[PDB]
Design a protein around this ligand. Structure first.
Ligand SMILES: CC(C)(COP(=O)(O)OP(=O)(O)OC[C@H]1O[C@@H](n2cnc3c(N)ncnc32)[C@H](O)[C@@H]1OP(=O)(O)O)[C@@H](O)C(=O)NCCC(=O)NCCS[C@@H](O)C[C@@](C)(O)CC(=O)O
Ligand SMILES: NC(=O)c1ccc[n+]([C@@H]2O[C@H](COP(=O)([O-])OP(=O)(O)OC[C@H]3O[C@@H](n4cnc5c(N)ncnc54)[C@H](O)[C@@H]3O)[C@@H](O)[C@H]2O)c1
Ligand SMILES: C[C@@](O)(CCO)CC(=O)[O-]
Lengths: 421, 375
């Protein structure tokens, strides 16, 4: 069984870290070659992915340590540009280990396919006409994709919503509820929506406009739970019971003030989005479903919950839409995306979804723990000290050195870093 | 500069590089940053984030035809999904015929929250804190003599109160800070941590969070576009019919969050790649975008689409856009500095105005294609 603790991983060299990861996972020489050498994404593949390609763009590729999900250790690849993200997530995962790690689950990979109908003077009546013939509609959609049905997916249901008074007149919107298995679902549900559109026009007598997937995938939920004891959060300056209370103060702040909830949820996506990028998935789709879900109640609030249990332990949850894919798009064509999937060892898209929410939950806890105690700057600015040196006017050889002087004076500021003069 | 770039799509990436270099007078140093893979050295990438074991590549593209306030610009984009660069370049082409994209922006102002709990008289303490704002503003600014010399710094204080939370009433002070050419997160977090003790001394509570807000509604960027019906006539539909179909798609997104989420996702399909190419924090931009889209309590569309008195299609995009030319990873990543040289931006707000123009163009391309698709 795998062991993800990785002692002293933080201070190894990039090549030494890569060698250590290679031995743990049994990666081939070609696998480690893809990360030890630039240009893993070939120009012919890149030119065929998006338009007007003139090259490639690199971001650091990292691994978060200590993660244990449903009793099994996991290494998590992350691709991002911001410091302290990987460190905080590894820290919080380390704390979660002592109490069993993370406990996750997920729903079926259900996606919405919208079919918008206009030009109807009786949208409410047309909705009942569609619901009456729903089996005839579901069958038509499922006969368009026999492979997905053989894989255990397909259209499961239809639901119809009406907007009888819009500025452009009455509107009817039918939702196909489609199990997309291991795909993100975009092209699967868009094709079904195109297939059922003429039948819907005949049933309702209106004009179908949009046939498009919805990114508010509130039926594709992934969940994560975590428990932290007061003893794990004790510092030389704060008691662990006080840290837990401060974290609860920060959670209620996010629940009532959207100015905080936006930043609170941003910290969650600081952990989720790099995993999305590392696996070649669409991070815009994940961000849209996350933040829109955060306002489903009519008030933009926190995606996570934080509570104290009857034992005084800090318990946290994260439940959110998580539409990710193992097949389709850049997940299969980017060789480093396929390597990330092998590093994770995930065998279904839902398994990858559960890892993502576990990381996001850990990320949010890391920001809150720092914010409630010493502040965010002490630990974050220390890992940011190289960039502050480049900003103050050094950057040549005067960098990688005056960063130390900032850290040792516990004063990573541009006003201080310019003490080069 | 002429950003039209004919015969660019079917060309080769080298000839594309050859072009872009010729149009801007790029150094052979700059051209080699993109000709040879590995513009980010390990020594640099190892000091950017933690636990670095490699680098991860995404295509680096340039959208054509864009024109902002009369000035032609080339827009670098970094993303994995197709059709984004093409739809943006073809919408920016139609915008050229009517003057291009027209943009404006507010001052680069960011919030810094200081949360204070345990105050028994938070409403009274709010006025006591506001009356001594000049001390708080001064103290915050003496922590960044550099920003103040460049014309920035903490400008104002606002105080909000929440008398009804399960953890008691809270007083939340907002530092209003001009961050000039930086995105501003670390900058205002330092200021927030610096003024918290004085705030506690005045209010008598206990300070908890000292952190910026990503809902940066004081750092708005605005974009405008105009399209005439003759530009939109297809094979089966008239240009007037296409405009009406685009308006139907907009009202759809305006009433249904399930559509608005996808509608706004298309907007960030154009913005986020520019954020990446310039080495900026795309999580902060995404959070500010979507939280702003539901400021009314109803999650709606960030863009607007109307038919003016001439029958022309007119679109807008106003949204928070905290970006930087300096700070974070912008000054550190070599290709990020190259992206800024390709763009020619001199301020962070100028980068912001370009971002919203690309998002507006991306949203138009998505709606034009969806509205014209036949049954
Ligand atoms: C982690 C810190 C940055 C510094 O750690 P420390 O000094 O305090 O304790 P330590 O004993 O030394 O390190 C303990 C453990 O941390 C890991 N570890 C430690 N250093 C490591 C390293 N260099 N490499 C690898 N692993 C490392 C490593 O696993 C280690 O275990 P080990 O014993 O070695 O086996 C912490 O201050 C911490 O989490 N800060 C929180 C920072 C944070 O959230 N950033 C998020 C981005 S901002 C913003 O976008 C988000 C937001 C705030 O706006 C959201 C919101 O508003 O909500
Ligand atoms: N939730 C969030 O959005 C969040 C939270 C915490 C940290 N961060 C991270 O903070 C970083 C952004 O912080 P930052 O923008 O302050 O960068 P920075 O901290 O790297 O640099 C800020 C300093 O640059 C100096 N400066 C010099 N010339 C300047 C000029 N013309 N204009 C403006 N500043 C100038 C200033 O003195 C300023 O203090 C990002 O990496 C971001 O990911 C983000
Ligand atoms: C086309 C679109 O779905 C982009 C796909 O990534 C956006 C939209 O529906 O408006």
């Amino acid at each position: 069984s795998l062991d993800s603790r990785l002692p002293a991983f933080r201070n190894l060299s990039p090549a030494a870290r890569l060698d250590h990861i290679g031995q743990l996972l049994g990666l081939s020489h070609d696998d480690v070659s893809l990360l030890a050498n630039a240009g893993a994404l070939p120009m012919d593949i890149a030119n065929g992915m998006i338009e007007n390609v003139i090259g490639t763009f690199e971001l650091p590729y990292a691994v978060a340590s200590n993660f244990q999900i449903n009793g099994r250790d996991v290494l998590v690849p992350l691709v991002v540009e911001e410091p302290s993200i990987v460190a905080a997530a590894s820290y919080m995962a380390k704390l979660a280990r002592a109490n069993g790690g993370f406990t996750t689950s997920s729903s079926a990979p259900l996606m919405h396919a919208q079919v918008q109908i206009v030009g109807i003077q009786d949208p409410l009546n047309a909705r009942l006409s569609l619901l009456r013939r729903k089996d005839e509609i579901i069958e038509l959609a499922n006969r368009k994709d026999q492979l997905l049905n053989s894989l255990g997916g397909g259209c499961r249901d239809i639901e119809v919503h009406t907007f009888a008074d819009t500025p452009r007149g009455p509107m009817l919107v039918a939702h196909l509820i489609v199990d997309v298995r291991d795909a993100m679902g975009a092209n699967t549900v868009n094709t079904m929506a195109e297939a059922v559109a003429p039948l819907m026009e005949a049933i309702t007598g209106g004009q179908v406009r949009l046939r498009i997937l919805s990114n508010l995938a509130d039926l594709r939920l992934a969940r994560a739970q975590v428990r932290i004891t007061p003893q794990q959060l004790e510092t030389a300056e704060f008691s662990g019971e006080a840290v837990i209370e401060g974290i609860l103060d920060a959670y209620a702040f996010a629940a009532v003030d959207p100015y905080r909830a936006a930043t609170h949820n941003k910290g969650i996506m600081n952990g989720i989005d790099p995993l999305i990028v590392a696996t070649g998935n669409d991070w815009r789709a994940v961000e849209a479903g996350a933040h829109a879900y955060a306002c489903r109640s009519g008030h933009y609030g926190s995606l996570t919950t934080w509570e104290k249990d009857n034992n005084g332990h800090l318990v946290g949850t994260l439940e959110m839409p998580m539409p990710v894919g193992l097949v389709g798009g850049a997940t299969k064509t980017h060789p480093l995306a396929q390597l990330s999937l092998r590093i994770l060892g995930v065998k279904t898209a839902q398994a990858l979804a559960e890892i993502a929410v576990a990381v996001g939950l850990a990320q949010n806890l890391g920001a809150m723990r720092a914010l409630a105690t010493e502040g965010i700057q002490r630990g974050h600015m220390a890992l940011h000290a190289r960039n502050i040196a480049v900003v103050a006017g050094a950057r040549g050889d005067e960098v990688d050195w005056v960063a130390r002087q900032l850290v040792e004076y516990h004063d990573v500021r541009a006003d201080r870093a310019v003490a080069l003069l």
